[PDB]
Each structure stands twice: as structure tokens, then as C-alpha cells.
Design a protein around this nucleic acid. Sequence first.
RNA 1: AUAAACGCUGAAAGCAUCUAAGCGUGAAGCCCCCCUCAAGAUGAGAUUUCCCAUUUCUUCGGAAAGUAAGAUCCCUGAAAG
RNA 2: UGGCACCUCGAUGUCGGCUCGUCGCAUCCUGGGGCUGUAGUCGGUCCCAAGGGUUGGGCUGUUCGCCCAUUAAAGCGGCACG
Lengths: 206, 36, 172, 143, 59
Amino acid sequence: TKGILGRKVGMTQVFTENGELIPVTVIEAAQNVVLQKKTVETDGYEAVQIGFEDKRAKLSNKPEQGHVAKADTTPKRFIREFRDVNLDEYEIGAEVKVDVFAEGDIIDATGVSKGKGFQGVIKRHGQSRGPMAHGSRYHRRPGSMGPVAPNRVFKNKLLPGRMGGEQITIQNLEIVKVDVEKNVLLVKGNVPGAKKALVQIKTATK
Amino acid sequence: MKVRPSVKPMCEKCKVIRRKGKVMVICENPKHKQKQ
Amino acid sequence: IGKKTIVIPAGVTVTLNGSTATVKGPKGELVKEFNPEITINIEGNEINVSRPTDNKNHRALHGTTRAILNNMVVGVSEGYEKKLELIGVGYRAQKQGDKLVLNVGYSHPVEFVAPKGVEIEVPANTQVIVKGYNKEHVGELAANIRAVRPPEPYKGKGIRYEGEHVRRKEGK
Amino acid sequence: RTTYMAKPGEVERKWYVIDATGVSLGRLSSEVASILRGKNKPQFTPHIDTGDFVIIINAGKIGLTGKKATDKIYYRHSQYPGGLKSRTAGEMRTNNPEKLLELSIKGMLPKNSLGRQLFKKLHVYGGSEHEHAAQKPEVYELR
Amino acid sequence: WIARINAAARMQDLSYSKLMHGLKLAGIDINRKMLADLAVNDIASFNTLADSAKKALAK
RNA sequence: AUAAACGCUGAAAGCAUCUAAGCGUGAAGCCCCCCUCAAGAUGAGAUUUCCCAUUUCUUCGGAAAGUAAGAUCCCUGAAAG
RNA sequence: UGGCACCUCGAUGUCGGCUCGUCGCAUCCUGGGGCUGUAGUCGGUCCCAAGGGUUGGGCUGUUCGCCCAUUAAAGCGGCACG
Ligand SMILES: [Mg+2]
Ligand SMILES: [Mg+2]
Ligand SMILES: [Mg+2]
Ligand SMILES: [Mg+2]
Ligand SMILES: [Mg+2]
Ligand SMILES: [Mg+2]
Ligand SMILES: [Mg+2]
Ligand SMILES: [Mg+2]
Ligand SMILES: [Mg+2]
Ligand SMILES: [Mg+2]
Ligand SMILES: [Mg+2]
Ligand SMILES: [Mg+2]
Ligand SMILES: [Zn+2]
């Protein structure tokens, strides 16, 4: 089990050896450093803590640069934890490269979806419209709120609200090419998020 | 297996038992299996 | 009527420290944890069994307990033998080292091994014997082997016991 | 006129350890719910908390008479449509022996703000060892 | 008063009902208001009355 | 771990018996595995790091008034609204 | 389908369809079994099981029904005949 953090760069396509054409997603994963190791005797669970991008010393604050100073590194921008990981490796202060993966590896992609604002029921929940003619006045409305007996409306009655901006995991994605020199990972398909969004690449759990 | 409220022997070789607090009969003839 | 007059003929020496009736013998060793409510009196030949009160609960445990001391001493000294047979075309049965391969007619071989204290052997390519000093274990294992392909009535094919009146039904 | 009424902090509250092995679930809980309430003291005042602190150990060895280990069901609804969940008494004693004792005692306490304060006074441990040795608790024998 | 005389009587190996039976049997006519007063303020005298009640129940 | 069901050993009730004690299999169902929220879980949890022990008053509980680490008002904005 | 006339006449909107569902099991499909006048492929009947699923049209205001063509299946009911 391995894991890195990266930034969603964009989408393109490549030609395989058969001549087949596939879509890929470009992820740049430079400057990964191991910060802290968590064990059972101190925390009750085992994890490894990773920082992705260093930032200017002005943006950092006093508490932050005392935590990265234990690993002898510049303060980082994104920090995440990975579980189900062998703690025998991952010495403190080491560099995590994209070479931990290889062509053909199956991974999982975790990210935060693109933001949609206040949205209605038939876009947010994929419901149906009413007739647009024949005298109807019901086009894009939620529906009946329920029966009369309870004197109330039940929970989980789907209604308009804020739509996007939520964490999504996409499973069983293939790796097409790894470029250690450019610190670039090519993943076949889609990953959640907009451009420049943080993506958490981890080996497949199944 | 017959699930009826009137479990009773059907031949001479039928035997009546109680398994897990339920009246039933067992017999060499599989057509004679009953359970209340 | 009767659930008494037990025998412990040689080759055995129980050492029941309340419940752990450890019975030694040439074949092996067997132990369990009889409920510490009824009487046990290990002697040179007999282990006296009796009930404090003559109630339905004690009448059942009197017969049950004694009947399985006789099971150990027979098993731990002489043992138990369970015999099995196979009927059907291409129903080969053979042993490879320790495991059992049965070609009962499925698309894959069926695999079986015997637990500790149980010995499984194949003298001929169409019969199986389960050997051991524990009646509960020997009888249980042979049931699983027979459960692979029970004898269907129309042609009688399948794993069957030697003494087994298979109800053969006419088919056509 | 002249009848003694206790004041908060006027009565001394003690710490007790109760061994809960072999005793029935409801026989123990009824006895405990009177110690927390303070009904064993002549200083008892209905509107004041004068009870004692109770620690229960060996909660995994509590007794369940008859077929209660499999036939007694504990229900739980999440206020969502069709969100009823159930557990058995025997299955909960093995996994969460602490929750079984607090569910029993909580129903034997007054259902108001003060009775909600007496529940914060009970500590249940599934094993034989507790962590309140600093309070120097005593051993209480059931009646 | 009753729930408070009961608590003090159980410290003398007695219940409230047995205490009340003994007092009336022996002839003491003190009511609940004052028996509860002794159980809180002058517990020493409450044990004196509990001895008279215990003896009357034993002839 | 179980439901219906199938068995082993086994007495009550010298036989018989899947049952009383004791064991083994056994469902798209139950509890887990998978995804998401979640410490206001007033039971308010845990780890790493940063700042420190100022000055005036009170009769005591204590108060106010400059600050440290840190954050904001205000301003340029979008990947957010 | 009815019997009664207990709340409502200082107002409790009444069929069918649309949008949105949720519950019961006396289970239509899928899952596990016993009996069979169960050779195999198909079936009949009963037991456990409510996890998911359960079509598009012609005629009629129609619920219902018949028909066309599919489907693993085109379940029966309650929620002021939601
Ligand atoms: Mg319009
Ligand atoms: Mg905290
Ligand atoms: Mg721009
Ligand atoms: Mg009517
Ligand atoms: Mg009238
Ligand atoms: Mg009105
Ligand atoms: Mg009206
Ligand atoms: Mg109105
Ligand atoms: Mg009308
Ligand atoms: Mg049913
Ligand atoms: Mg069938
Ligand atoms: Mg209606
Ligand atoms: Zn018969």
C-alpha cells in the first residue's frame, strides 16, 4: 500500500501500443515529504502524515513551522494522513516520489467535487418535470411532501440546496504512465475536482 | 413435509416426537413427514 | 432398563479431577468436562454413576454420562471403524498423501482431510474408511463425505453406507 | 415551620465499588438506583442530590435468567423512515457490557433534570479493574 | 417523614413497618413529624425508641 | 452469528430418536467488509507544535488595561458564492 | 357490498391522471429448503426470506378490462379509496 498527494493539472489523451485511444488525467505530485508517524502506543491507530507543497514563510505561522522543523523541511500547504500503510518504511523527513507506483497499477482517487451553488431538485437529485403544456402549471417543483396522517413531513425528503463541494472517491483507476523526471502521473479516466485541486492517490482497497 | 395443525400418525411405523418444542412425526415413508 | 454396570478393562486409567475424565489407552487420549453434579467413582473396573435426586433432569444425565464413558474406553483401547462406499460410473476415490480427491461427477474435484486424531485411508478406488478413537469425530467426518453426493433413489448412485436401506424409486 | 431540608454540598457523598458477577440484571440495578438517589439516608431531600457515587466492575458476568440472552431485544429508532434497529441482551453483554447496565439503571431513575444528573454519577466497567483509585472507594455488599 | 424514618430504621436491622408495629404495640404515641426530627438531629434518641419497639415485638 | 432445513454423539424410555446436556453444516436476509457525515458524543475525546506567567486596583470570591502566539476590520479577487 | 348515525353543515374539496414517496407480507422475480403420480429439460405444492427490482403502447374520463410487443418478473394491499 502506497500513497501520494498531487494537483489536478488537466485532461488529455494518449495512444497505446495497440493503437487504441484512451483519456487520461495529468497529476503533478512534487515535493512530498513525510512529516509524522502515528503508532498505537501513542495514538491507538497507525498512520503516516504527508505534506505536499511548500509555501512562503510569510504565509506560514509560528505553530506550523515548529511542527515541520522536526522533519527538517519548509512549511507545507497540504497535509493529509494515510492509513493501512506499512510503517516499516517511511522514515521521517524522506521524500515520497511518484516511482512508488508503476504502469498498470490500480489506484483510488479522493477529492472534492466542483462547486455548484443553490440548485433545484431536478438538477441536484435528478427528478422529473411536470408537463410543459396542456394547461399545466407544474414544471420544476419538488413534488408532494408526503401523506396526511403523520401531520408532518419525514426526514430525507429531498429539496433544493447547495449542490457540490463534497468529497468523492472513485475506485479502480488504472495508471498509464509514470514520469519521475517531471513528477507526473497519468491516470486513465476522471478524478473529482476542478483544475489545481488536490487529489489523493492511494492503492486500491479491493 | 406437511405443516398442519393436525399432526397425527398415518401408519403403524409412524412415531411421534417433539423437536425444539414442536410436535412432529417421523417415519420411513417420506410422505408421512409432518410438523405442527 | 438400566444405565449402570460400566467396565474399564485394562489399557485405561481414568484420572477425573472432578470433571476432566482423562482416559489413557493404546489408541490415544480423550478428555471432557462432565457436569460436576452426578457421582463418579473410578475403581479398578467400574466408574459408579448415580443421581442425587430422582428427577427428569437427573434421569437423562445419568444415562447420557455413563453411555459415553463406555464410548471412550472402547475407543481409547480398541477404536471405532466407519466404512463408506461409492456407486456410480466414474466415481473414483483415491488418496494423494494426506488429502482425499473424489470424482463424484461435479466439474471440480472435492477435497477432504481428517482432523487430529482421525485417520482417513483408501484401500480400494471405490471405498473409504474413517479411523479414530473418538466416536463423535469419526461419525461426523463420514457424514460430510456422504453429504457430497447422497444416494439418489432412481439409480442409487452416490456415497452410501454399507448398512443403508436406500429407498429405490421407480423412474420410468 | 420546622422540618429539616438539606442544602447542596451539606451532605457527604461517598464512593462505592460493587461486584456484579452472578447477580441478576434487574436485582442489581434496583439496588443501585437507590444509592444514587440517596434514599438510604435520613437526610433525604427530594429536590437535592444527596446520593453516593457507584462503580460497577465485572459487568460482563451479569446474570440473565431463562432465555433472556437470546429472547430479550433492545430497540433503537433513528427518526428516519424505517430506521429501527435491534440487539439482543446476550449479544450486548459480550460486546458492550457497559451499555447493558446503563440502559437498565437509566430506566429506574426519575425522568427529569435532576435524575439526568444522577446518571452522570455511575461508572460501569466490563472488566475487573477500574481507574478511580484516587477517590479511595469502598466495597459495598448487596442486600 | 415516612421515607425518612424508613432510612434510619434500616440502620438498626428493622424496616419502617416493623418499627411502627412495635411502637404502637408498646404504647409510644409519637407521630411521624417528630420521629423524623429525631432521625436527623438527635439520632442518639431515635435508637432508644427503636430499642423499645424491638423489645415489644419480642414479648 | 443465524432462519427454514440436513446431520453426529446421546439418554429420558436396555431398542429408537437432530435434543435434555454437548457438537457440525446452513440464505439475495442480520452484524461486519465498501462510500459519505459525524465530539453541542454538555459522555463536549486524542496527537504534534506555538505563547507565556505583566501592570493597577479590590475586604475576600474577583475586576480593568496594555499585550504575546493568533485572528480580524479594510482592500484586489475566484478554483467559491 | 352493507348496518348504526358517534365528530364535522359560523364549509373536513369529491373520480381518474402527473410529481414525490413510505410502510405491511397473505412473495410476482431473484436467494435457501421438504414432499412429489420428482428419469433429464420443465413443472405442482408447502416452509424460511421484505435486500433490490417489478415495461412501452391501441380503445375508453375512466379505476377495471381486452388486445399488440417485450421482460428474470410485469405482486397484492395501507397511508383522509396517501
Ligand atoms: Mg407556464
Ligand atoms: Mg479536544
Ligand atoms: Mg483567472
Ligand atoms: Mg362503512
Ligand atoms: Mg340515538
Ligand atoms: Mg371555523
Ligand atoms: Mg366541507
Ligand atoms: Mg377552513
Ligand atoms: Mg361528495
Ligand atoms: Mg412468510
Ligand atoms: Mg421446490
Ligand atoms: Mg384520495
Ligand atoms: Zn408412517
